[PDB]
Design a protein around this ligand. Structure first.
Ligand SMILES: [N+]
Length: 128
């Protein structure tokens, strides 16, 4: 959910447009994305796991497993795998609209509020 979000609908923020420059833009949409982090038995991981993929527990109804809990999941190949549940992360993603009417979906980490100190790499590419 949007619980704990530090950016409001209608807020003016700064972000990179695909043309390479940084511009002021307005927030027109907001959403949350919940992903699980799991460690596979082969030494690899996923930090993008759909909570609905876990088959040893109904995570949509009951919430996430305990941290460190051993789980079973169904991967995108349709097969079942064992993994260790590490943690759940809910992040906020925003849709912005530029002066020219173009739009872009941006993660919170790629947005700069107007109070934040901008890096030298951002002020040199900033359009007024
Ligand atoms: N903010």
């Amino acid at each position: 959910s949007m619980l704990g979000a530090d950016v409001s609908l209608g807020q003016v923020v700064i972000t990179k447009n695909r043309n390479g420059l940084y511009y002021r833009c307005r927030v027109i949409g907001a959403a949350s994305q919940t992903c699980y982090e799991v460690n596979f038995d082969d030494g690899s991981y996923s930090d993008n796991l759909y909570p609905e993929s876990i088959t040893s527990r109904d995570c949509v109804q009951l919430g996430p497993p305990s941290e460190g809990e051993l789980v079973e999941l169904r991967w995108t190949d349709g097969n079942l795998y064992k993994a260790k549940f590490i943690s759940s992360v809910t992040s906020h993603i925003y849709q912005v609209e530029f002066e020219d009417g173009s739009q872009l979906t941006v993660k919170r980490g790629d947005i700069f509020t107007l109070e934040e100190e901008l890096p030298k790499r951002v002020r040199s590419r900033l359009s007024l």
